[PDB]
Amino acid sequence: TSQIVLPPHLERIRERLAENIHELWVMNKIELGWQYGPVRDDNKRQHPCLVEFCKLPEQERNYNLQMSLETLKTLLALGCHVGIADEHAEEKVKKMKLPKNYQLTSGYKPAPMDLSFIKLTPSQEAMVDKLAENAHNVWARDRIRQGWTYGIQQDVKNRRNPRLVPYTLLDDRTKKSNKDSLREAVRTLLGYGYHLEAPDQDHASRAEVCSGTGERFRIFRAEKTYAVKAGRWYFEFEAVTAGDMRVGWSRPGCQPDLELGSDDRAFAFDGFKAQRWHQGNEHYGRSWQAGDVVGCMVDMNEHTMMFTLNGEILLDDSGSELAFKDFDVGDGFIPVCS
Amino acid sequence: LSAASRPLCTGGHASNKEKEMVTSLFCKLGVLVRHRISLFGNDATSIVNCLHILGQTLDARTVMKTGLDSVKSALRAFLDNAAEDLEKTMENLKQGQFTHTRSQPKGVTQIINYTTVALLPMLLDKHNVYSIYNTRSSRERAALSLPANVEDVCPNIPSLEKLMTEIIELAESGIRYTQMPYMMEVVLPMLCSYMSRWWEHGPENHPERAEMCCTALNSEHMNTLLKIIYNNLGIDEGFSQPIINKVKPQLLKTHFLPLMEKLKKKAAMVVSEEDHLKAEARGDMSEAELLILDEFTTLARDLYAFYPLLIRFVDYNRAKWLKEPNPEAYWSKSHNFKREEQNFVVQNEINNMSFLITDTKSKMSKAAISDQERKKMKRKGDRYSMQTSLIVAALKRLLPIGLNICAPGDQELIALAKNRFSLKDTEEEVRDIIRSNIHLQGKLEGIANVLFHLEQKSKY
């Protein structure tokens, strides 16, 4: 996916934020341990890229500015208001706080301060993960165009990377360095004083409750020849996961196709909705934990119905041991399930 | 059309406009009811002295009921509609309710007070931006020590405005946040400190008349919710409080127990009232990590079970004093109750023999005796139901002793319930005086003969 464009009003704030984030990034890179290198001598721990922001070449500076612009675009494109109130103190509202700490060695070592005491917004980790996912789409597109680190049909490359799958193959341990870098970036943002909301929380209706419903429903019952007519029978049903399950009695099929407990042909009881099912909805019974036995029981002589969940009889709001009453004998009743 | 508190959403704008009308009419009532002159603007074309309104006194009472009770299912509907302005609207409504109950109104708004209080458990400024409890703190400083402030400190000193059951019902309504706290835990503790300190420093009896139910003052009582009367503690502390210091509340809870255990008075209405006050003062409402720390819970429950079993053992026919004590649910207390019940069944059988033949005169006295017996049965039915529920589960794995102990009581009640119409009509009258008043059976989370206790005893 690709996100919205940066409005022209934010260009100055983007430039200032990019400048200070380049400064912090380059001094963090210098603090990492590598030194200055003339030309491509990484084997000697000498990095030409590890220079100050002002000392960066034109191409590297343009690439870094474009990367910062893309990250700021991604940050502002979520939808939550990013109206900055605590402006970063640099030549505008000057409240210089970086030289509060001080570390220096042989080389250019400016002093950054990261305010970790401030409360990180709960949605900031979501922003970090969304940045990672957007960059995953970026390098997925790049590898689709190129064919790098894996030869599928050309058989030119080998050692396929797990970056093709965005989340499943790449565990949190594999990308700890990138996660810590993004955490440091958002920590610097919070130290600057950005206040962020949490749209993807309980404040706004955004949670996903069920993958689907209204179909993929099945009915389980025995042969019609076992339709009991007399006596009082007992059978057991056990539940493994809470959900839309109807357990009760059915009849030989007369209605074309309808769910349990919503017509003449079927009697049903539910605990997930805590309501019995018989030609409508009527609240009855409690829910069940994982690994519970419904414990069904038949009373055919006086046309009464009732249940025993784990030996505990279920009583309705009126306080009775009667799930159903006053129904015709019909062509018998059969244990049924949904 | 942006959806917000009152940007465009008419569904919530209805209740918010009701709240705005409440605020406007509360200002219009603060200009008139607390006139402080009572003669300004006299003879409003007939006799009336009004503060430039003269027509909104009854209309405010008519519309406040609709404004505060915008929907019967207030708890769910308010949360579904919004989660921002509910706290401030309820705070302003409660402040206006207090500043109206300070005065003498003709109609009583206890039902609306309870309806507004029902919003408090359901769950903003977090009591920081807006001081919701400032007016309540003033009204609570008015009676910060009821045994010490039972005098003319109440505003205008009538016997009907504040010095009545109205203040205790208002306190019970206002202080209820068991489901979720809705405050910063600052402005309530330093009134609760005075209340608890004077509770310990009282040693006083013979309270004021018409307010015998002092037990309805607090329902969310717990640790930090006494030696901290604050005169030197304010300088000592102001960072340190009972939240961090876990020593003193445990010491006070351990101090409370032997004093209440020592009370073993027999055959006294004053003993009954003292026991009820003791149960309310130091009951089982202390929810401070009772699940993890089980020794305190076990000791407290054992004492709260040993007290009434030994109290109501002898005859104690006058059981009307106990309104609705909290039960606070194999056991030694269960065995003791089984022995007490099987001893009580003998007196019940003697009474049944008396009812069978040689009946007394004065059919109205027959009704009175049957009412007393029905009250005793109603009081014992709840504890019998819990005991039967405990016994049935106990006898499942291995407990023939419980079933053998419970067997004679089944036959005792079966013999008692053969033909008792002269008791059944009186029991129906007693249960019609107050229908259930707790509806304990329907909670699934007051009582007659053939219910849960009977079916659980018969099921085995």
Swiss-Prot record, chain A:
Sequence ranges assigned to domain B30.2/SPRY in this UniProt record: 157-338
Modification after translation: Channel activity is modulated by phosphorylation. Phosphorylation is increased in failing heart, leading to calcium leaks and increased cytoplasmic Ca(2+) levels.
Subcellular location: Sarcoplasmic reticulum membrane
Sequence repeats by residue range: 1-98, 99-212
Function: Cytosolic calcium-activated calcium channel that mediates the release of Ca(2+) from the sarcoplasmic reticulum into the cytosol and thereby plays a key role in triggering cardiac muscle contraction. Aberrant channel activation can lead to cardiac arrhythmia. In cardiac myocytes, calcium release is triggered by increased Ca(2+) cytosolic levels due to activation of the L-type calcium channel CACNA1C. The calcium channel activity is modulated by formation of heterotetramers with RYR3. Required for cellular calcium ion homeostasis. Required for embryonic heart development.
Assigned protein family: Belongs to the ryanodine receptor (TC 1.A.3.1) family. RYR2 subfamily.
Subunit architecture: Homotetramer. Can also form heterotetramers with RYR1 and RYR3. Interacts with CALM and S100A1; these interactions regulate channel activity. Identified in a complex composed of RYR2, FKBP1B, PKA catalytic subunit, PRKAR2A, AKAP6, and the protein phosphatases PP2A and PP1. Interacts directly with FKBP1B, PKA, PP1 and PP2A. Interacts with FKBP1A and FKBP1B; these interactions may stabilize the channel in its closed state and prevent Ca(2+) leaks. Interacts with SELENON. Identified in a complex, composed of FSD2, CMYA5 and RYR2.
Domains as described in the record: The calcium release channel activity resides in the C-terminal region while the remaining part of the protein resides in the cytoplasm.
Protein name: Ryanodine receptor 2
Included range, full protein: 869 to 1206 of 4966
